[PDB]
């Protein structure tokens, strides 16, 4: 299927998303550094077919392995700078998100 | 673990033992569902 | 001087000569900033006003009797910016002179 | 042999140019590929033929040493020949050029040859009671609707007329068959009338190959009498021609073969068993196929004669047409299949044509065969042109796409957008994107990106299936942690937790198998599992565990 | 268009304009290479040039 | 997996030549089998045998004798020897010096 760029990504706390806006793409002017997310993109993982005891650890804490895994654009390690511009090229068939 | 390595000709018999079944058709994948 | 070298092109004695009249450099779709932003080669369309003249196979020395005229499109030719550089796929390129 | 001293010149210099290896060549080499092969043979033994003066100050000898004299032999021999034996295409061109391309209305002659060759086999069929009994059985079989009535014919020479001429066949067949010196004229006239039919292809094919099976059973018993006695018992070959050959069913040629009281005869006592039993076999087989042996023997022998005549002329037909086949194939050359693949698929189509021909239509064979051949060649080019086999209608769609794209490129100014092809064609605009992403061919993983190392493309492809060693070293730690947590549980709850998932065992089990293991209903087992889970959910058994959920 | 576009788009005499600098551009434009299609290679020359 | 058909990005697969060579050998092998079933005139089956021999000979060591078959890229495509032999085979780079 497709890949989204939404600002909701599995397996990362809200503290690591004070930079991304609602549409998924970082604010212009935010000071990022290595490991931050410049763009929040997830790709569908179907399906996991998980392990033994990992299954028990899932049952214990009632969580659900997400149907998606994340492949989001994070700053290469070492880099540290100011996002000074962001353009959004969109295919013609698609419909533009909020940021575009 | 092991020792010397032998190289030699291979009979058709030894080759048929190496394999796991013969390849008859020349197609690779299924072009829409890529199984 | 590249059109005269092959024009006019005659048939195999066919009493029909496709002769060149002139050409012109079109207007560039994108200017160099937009051409870098989109990843396009900055260039100009090349219109050519050929002309098919025909002679029917009687006389005298191919009577020009049934001729035509058009403006044909033969390819786009990249353009050198005001600093002598090209934009070939949004990337700046330079054609280094050769010593042959 | 100036070549031979060219080699010594290249040696005593330590290198050869293209100038020298153009000087000391044979003056009669016109095919450049011969020059290619011989300069390769030279370099293979030394010395490498660079194109200029160098090696001037490069004093570096990997050209030793048995290859030297062998390669010199091959070079000294290349003048003895003229080639080529290296291009299959040219050797095939010569091969077809051997056969004179002159069958100018000899085609109809050889075609009539085929017709009256495949009717000697028709007669030999007409003398085979078993195939004709099959035809009668399947007449009464299909008219009873045991199959479609057309199961017997691909057309013939009326339903009730068909079935009742089959009825007259039945009556002529009974007057043929119960008149066991009366069968001669009846059987022969019934075969005369019978030869006016037109079988189903598979019908005739099966019946005649089972005719062959019948005669081959007779032939196998012939082996059993031949090698068992003449080649194993040392029976005299002249003897095997004398006594057995001619009678073949009575007991007067083998049982009167041991009895002939000779050095050969009274040694037949040890292979006497299988000949004794083979006589039983053949004697019952005479009636098994419907006639004594020698009759159907020589009828199928004439069958073989007729089929050989048929095939040997279709050869000349096929070659005289393949002279055309090559030409017809040459207009499909870049389409993805190398040339000799094309002409081979063409020749397959050509054999197809020659085995479906008719002079009756009064036309020229060329057009019919060329229709067959172009059809089969395009079938080939379709079915085996790409590394991923895309179907044929899809290739039609792709061709439409290419043509209309080239057209819009020179009519709509700049280029065709697929949104524009969605209108220019009557397609749904995701069919177009699909067919465009489907028609592209694969990139070769050895295509070199021109970098420093000259590494190719196939070395920049990560393996997105492997697990990172950190992840495996995690779940090993997870096995540790879960085993630890279970250790601090009652053996009931721990065994139920393990047996419920697949934790450190083979297959996980349903609740009922677990109750089996403990003699409880599955509800008891659900209670146990829920209590163990509730116990584990609390920290002090679950801090590290929940930390495995890193989020 | 294909031939001229593969000249301009991919050939040894069409390079990324080195631009880390004003002088870098201005001295990459005024450059006289002796390689490329129609010119000798590295192996074949060689201390002639 | 040693001659994979990995999916690159954009539905544009990448393969190694060995798939092309194995296709070329299996095609002519099957065609020869069908010729032998049809009882063809031995001219065509002779050409088919020679074609299959060139296929196997270009699969074993391409460019050895008969002007190596070139892939779709214009290029003389590699064979088992070229994955073994030469400066670029196994024995030289990944068998002596690795990342
Ligand atoms: C490096 C190599 C030589 C440089 C010229 C160039 C030549 C053709 C290029 C490929 C094509 O674009 C097709 C394809 C487009 C995909 O969308 C992205 C991948 C592909 C495979 C490309 C990667 C790379 O760039 C290629 C191999
Ligand atoms: C660094 C190198 C340039 C050297 C001049 C360029 C030229 C060809 C590029 C690869 C291809 O595009 C195919 C593939 C596309 C994927 O999407 C990303 C991975 C791949 C392997 C690419 C990595 C890199 O970008 C390559 C090696």
Swiss-Prot record, chain A:
Signal peptide: none annotated. It comes from the Bacteria. The RNAP catalytic core consists of 2 alpha, 1 beta, 1 beta' and 1 omega subunit. When a sigma factor is associated with the core the holoenzyme is formed, which can initiate transcription. Belongs to the RNA polymerase beta chain family. DNA-dependent RNA polymerase catalyzes the transcription of DNA into RNA using the four ribonucleoside triphosphates as substrates. This is DNA-directed RNA polymerase subunit beta. It comes from Escherichia coli O157:H7. The gene is rpoB.
Curated annotation (Swiss-Prot), chain C:
It comes from the Bacteria. Belongs to the RNA polymerase beta chain family. The RNAP catalytic core consists of 2 alpha, 1 beta, 1 beta' and 1 omega subunit. When a sigma factor is associated with the core the holoenzyme is formed, which can initiate transcription. DNA-dependent RNA polymerase catalyzes the transcription of DNA into RNA using the four ribonucleoside triphosphates as substrates. This is DNA-directed RNA polymerase subunit beta. It comes from Escherichia coli O157:H7. The gene is rpoB. The chain holds residues 51 to 150 of 1342 of the full protein.
UniProtKB/Swiss-Prot annotation, chain F:
This is DNA-directed RNA polymerase subunit beta'. The RNAP catalytic core consists of 2 alpha, 1 beta, 1 beta' and 1 omega subunit. When a sigma factor is associated with the core the holoenzyme is formed, which can initiate transcription. The rRNA transcription and antitermination complex (rrnTAC) consists of RNAP, NusA, NusB, NusE (rpsJ), NusG, SubB, ribosomal protein S4, DNA and precursor rRNA; S4 is more flexible than other subunits. DNA-dependent RNA polymerase (RNAP) catalyzes the transcription of DNA into RNA using the four ribonucleoside triphosphates as substrates. The gene is rpoC. Co-administration of salinamide and rifampicin or salinamide and myxopyronin suppresses the emergence of resistance to both antibiotics. Belongs to the RNA polymerase beta' chain family. Acetylated on several lysine residues in the presence of glucose.
């Amino acid at each position: 299927g497709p890949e989204e760029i939404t600002a909701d990504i599995p397996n990362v706390g809200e503290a690591a998303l004070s930079k991304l806006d609602e549409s998924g793409i970082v604010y212009i002017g935010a000071e990022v550094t290595g490991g931050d997310i410049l763009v929040g993109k997830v790709t569908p993982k179907g399906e996991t077919q998980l392990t033994p005891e990992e299954k028990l650890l899932r049952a214990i804490f009632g969580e659900k392995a997400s149907d998606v895994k994340d492949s989001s654009l994070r700053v290469p390690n070492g880099v540290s700078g100011t996002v000074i511009d962001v353009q959004v090229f969109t295919r013609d068939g698609v419909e533009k998100d909020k940021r575009a | 673990e092991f020792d010397a390595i032998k190289i030699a000709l291979a009979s058709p018999d030894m080759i048929r033992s190496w394999s796991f079944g013969e390849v008859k058709k020349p197609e690779t994948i299924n072009y829409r569902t890529f199984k | 001087a590249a059109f005269r070298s092959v024009f006019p092109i005659q048939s195999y004695s066919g009493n029909s000569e496709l002769q060149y009249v002139s050409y012109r450099l079109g207007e560039p779709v994108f200017d160099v900033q937009e051409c870098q932003i989109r990843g396009v080669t900055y260039s100009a369309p090349l219109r050519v006003k050929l002309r098919l003249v025909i002679y029917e196979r009687e006389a005298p020395e191919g009577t020009v009797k049934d001729i035509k005229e058009q403006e044909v499109y033969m390819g786009e030719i990249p353009l050198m910016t005001d600093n002598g550089t090209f934009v070939i796929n949004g990337t700046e390129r330079v054609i280094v002179s050769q010593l042959h | 042999s100036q070549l031979k001293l060219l080699v010594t010149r290249g040696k005593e210099q330590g290198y050869l140019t293209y100038a020298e290896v153009n000087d000391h060549l044979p003056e009669d080499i016109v095919d450049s590929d011969q020059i290619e092969d011989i300069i390769q043979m030279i370099n293979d033994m030394g010395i490498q033929v660079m194109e200029e003066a160098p090696d001037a100050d490069d004093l570096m000898n990997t050209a030793d040493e048995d290859a030297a004299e062998a390669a010199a032999q091959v070079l000294s021999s290349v003048e003895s020949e003229i080639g080529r034996t290296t291009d299959p295409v040219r050797m095939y061109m010569r091969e077809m050029g051997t056969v004179e391309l002159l069958t100018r209305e000899g085609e109809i002659d050889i075609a009539k040859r085929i017709e009256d060759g495949i009717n000697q086999v028709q007669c030999s069929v007409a003398e085979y009671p078993e195939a004709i009994t099959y035809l009668l059985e399947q007449y009464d079989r299909v008219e009873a609707e045991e199959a479609r009535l057309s199961d017997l014919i691909t057309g013939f020479v009326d339903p009730e007329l068909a079935r009742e001429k089959f009825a007259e066949l039945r009556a002529q067949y009974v007057v043929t068959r119960d008149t066991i010196a009366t069968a001669q004229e009846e059987i022969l006239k019934l075969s005369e009338v019978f030869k006016q039919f037109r079988l189903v292809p598979k019908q005739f094919d099966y019946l005649v190959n089972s005719m062959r099976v019948m005669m081959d059973r007779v032939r196998t018993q012939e082996r059993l009498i031949m090698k068992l006695c003449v080649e194993q018992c040392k029976m005299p070959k002249k003897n095997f021609i004398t006594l057995f050959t001619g009678n073949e069913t009575s007991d007067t040629w083998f049982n009167a073969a041991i009895a002939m009281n000779k050095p050969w005869s009274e040694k037949l006592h040890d292979v006497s068993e299988e000949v004794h039993r083979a006589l039983q076999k053949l004697q019952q087989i005479e009636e098994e196929t419907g006639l004594t042996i020698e009759q159907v023997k020589d009828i199928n022998r004439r069958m073989s004669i007729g089929e050989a005549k048929a095939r040997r002329a279709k050869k000349e037909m096929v070659e005289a047409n393949l002279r055309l086949v090559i030409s017809i194939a040459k207009k499909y050359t870049n389409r993805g299949l190398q040339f000799l693949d094309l002409i081979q698929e063409g020749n397959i189509g050509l054999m197809k044509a020659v085995d479906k021909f008719e002079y009756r239509r009064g036309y020229k064979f060329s057009t019919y065969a060329t229709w067959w051949i172009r059809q089969a060649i395009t079938r080939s080019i379709a079915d085996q042109a790409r590394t991923i086999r895309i179907p044929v209608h899809m290739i039609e769609t792709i061709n439409k796409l290419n043509r209309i794209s080239r057209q819009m490129l020179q009519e709509m100014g700049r280029e065709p957008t697929p949104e524009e092809l969605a209108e220019r064609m009557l397609m749904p605009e995701d069919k177009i994107r699909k067919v465009l992403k489907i028609a592209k061919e694969p990139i070769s993983m050895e295509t070199p990106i021109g970098d420093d190392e000259d590494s190719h493309l196939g070395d920049f492809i990560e393996d997105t299936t492997l697990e990172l060693p950190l992840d495996s070293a995690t779940t090993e730690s997870l096995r540790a942690a879960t085993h630890d947590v279970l250790a601090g549980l009652t053996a009931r709850e721990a065994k139920v937790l393990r047996m419920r998932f697949g934790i450190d065992m083979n297959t996980d089990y349903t609740l009922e198998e677990v109750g089996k293991q403990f003699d409880v209903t599955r509800e008891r087992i659900r209670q146990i599992e829920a209590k163990a889970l509730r116990k584990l959910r609390h920290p002090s058994r679950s801090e590290v565990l929940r930390s495995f959920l890193d989020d | 268009s294909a031939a001229v576009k593969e000249f301009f788009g991919s050939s040894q005499l069409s390079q990324f304009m080195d631009q880390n600098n004003p002088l870098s551009e201005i001295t990459h434009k005024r450059r006289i290479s002796a390689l490329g299609p129609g010119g000798l290679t590295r192996e074949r020359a060689g201390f002639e040039v | 997996d040693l001659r994979p058909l990995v999916p690159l990005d954009g539905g544009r697969f990448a393969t190694s030549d060995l798939n092309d060579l194995y296709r070329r050998v299996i095609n002519r092998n099957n065609r020869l089998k069908r010729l032998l079933d049809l009882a063809a005139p031995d001219i065509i089956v002779r050409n088919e045998k020679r074609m299959l021999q060139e296929a196997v000979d270009a699969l074993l060591d391409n460019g050895r004798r008969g002007r190596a078959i070139t892939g779709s890229n214009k290029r003389p495509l590699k064979s088992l020897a070229d994955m073994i032999k030469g400066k670029q085979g196994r024995f030289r780079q990944n068998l002596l010096g690795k990342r």
